[PDB]
């Protein structure tokens, strides 16, 4: 419902930019525009909420991934989700740029939250002996950030996947 | 510098709500007020950032706590940090309201982030056999929230510690 509105926000802001038709987001989410407005009264609030929700969905996937997969495989799956997040962030670049230029702070403590999710994955994989234990999570984060910077476009997805494979291979015991 | 400002903001807004003077926050953070205005050009932007920082610090303590303590004791230490957060939240009630009434949203996905931190703690403690595995993290969240609502005054400190003990005892395994 909320997740539906904010998923729709990512899509519509990515396609239409800052000037997106808000009624389109409501309708795609199967919701009235009064409902959209009661929850997200300004377009900047909606943009920021959509960004924050991408961040939270990425971070909050970790316990479930660790529950279902061996920890190095959990880390690998999560790195794909990190690129999905990067591709989303890039998709709504014009919208996020506008919120910042108008005085907003969509980002807040997102970098720390994402770093901590990575630390949780890497501590579990290192404890299991599935990865080396001497790599810092802050350096892995920088590696993923660079792959985001070079390879976040939808058309760069194969290169992004191969670069993720290379960095994950750098973690091998 | 930012962590300092934001920590000071939470402290001052939770104590004084909207009577908070920005000069007091700058002072406690040890920074010049121009520096504070440069970074947070609006009182509501300061309040929102302070709240979000408080949530993220609470969530991000989980890996480190699980690295240093047996997982049920990690859970216990973190639940005290949760009550610290929820007490601050209650104290910042007027300030958080003012962020809303200007069309902003301090809360975002905070509930989800904090519930997930709780899930991480409870998953580890159940895997280790140190707690039962059949309690829901949304229920544990509501239990801790309730303690913050009943037992937030400085004179209720000991009660809050006893309620935390009671809730953690409800988590005890069969064997
Ligand atoms: Cl944040």
Ligand 1 center from residue A134 Cα (angstroms): 28
Asked if B59 has any chain A CB less than 8 Å from its own CB, the reply is yes
Cα(A31)–Cα(A162) distance, integer angstroms: 40
Interface touch B62/A116, C-beta < 8 Å: yes
Q: Per the structure block, which two tokens stand in for A103?
A: 């005085």
Sequence-distant (≥ 6) Cβ neighbours of residue A10 within 8 angstroms: A50, A54, A88, A91, A92
Question: A-B interface: how many C-beta pairs under 8 angstroms?
Answer: 71
Residues of B in contact with A103 (CB under 8 A): 41-42, 45
Asked if A35 has any chain B CB less than 8 Å from its own CB, the reply is no
Cα(A17)–Cα(A10) distance, integer angstroms: 10
| Domain boundaries, position A116 | 1-173
Is the CB of residue B94 less than 8 Å from the CB of residue B18? yes
Q: How far is CA A11 from CA A21, A87, A166, in A?
A: 12, 11, 30
How many angstroms is the resolution? 1.8
Asked if A69 has any chain B CB less than 8 Å from its own CB, the reply is no
Asked if A103 has any chain B CB less than 8 Å from its own CB, the reply is yes
Is the CB of residue A92 less than 8 Å from the CB of residue A13? yes
State the structure-solving technique: X-ray
Of B63, B66, B113, the CB nearest to A60: B113
- List the 37-56 stretch of A: residues with Cβ below 8 A of B: 40-42, 45, 48-49, 52-53, 55-56
CATH classification at residue A130 = 1.10.357.10
Q: Per the structure block, which two tokens stand in for B8?
A: 């000071």
Is the CB of residue A116 less than 8 Å from the CB of residue B63? yes
> In chain B, how many domains are there?
1
Cα(B43)–Cα(B37) distance, integer angstroms: 9
What DSSP string describes A50-73? HHHHHHHHHHTTHHHHHHHS-HHH
Which DSSP symbol is given to A155? G
Is the CB of residue B80 less than 8 Å from the CB of residue B30? no
């Amino acid at each position: 419902n909320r997740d539906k509105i904010l998923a729709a926000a990512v899509r519509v802001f990515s396609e239409e930019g800052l000037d997106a038709h808000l009624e389109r987001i409501a309708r795609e989410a199967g919701v009235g525009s009064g409902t959209l407005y009661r929850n997200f009264p300004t377009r900047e609030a909606l943009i920021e909420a959509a960004y924050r929700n991408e961040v939270a969905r990425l971070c909050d996937s970790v316990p479930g991934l660790l529950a279902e997969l061996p920890p190095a495989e959990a880390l690998r799956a999560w790195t794909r989700r990190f690129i999905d997040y990067a591709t989303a962030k890039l998709g709504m670049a014009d919208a996020l740029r506008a919120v910042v230029a108008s005085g907003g702070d969509p980002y807040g403590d997102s970098r720390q939250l994402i770093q901590s999710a990575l630390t949780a994955l890497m501590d579990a994989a290192a404890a299991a002996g599935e990865i080396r234990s001497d790599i810092r999570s802050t350096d892995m984060f920088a590696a993923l950030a660079g792959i985001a910077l070079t390879s976040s476009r939808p058309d760069q997805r194969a290169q992004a996947e191969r670069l993720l494979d290379l960095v994950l291979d750098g973690l091998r015991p």
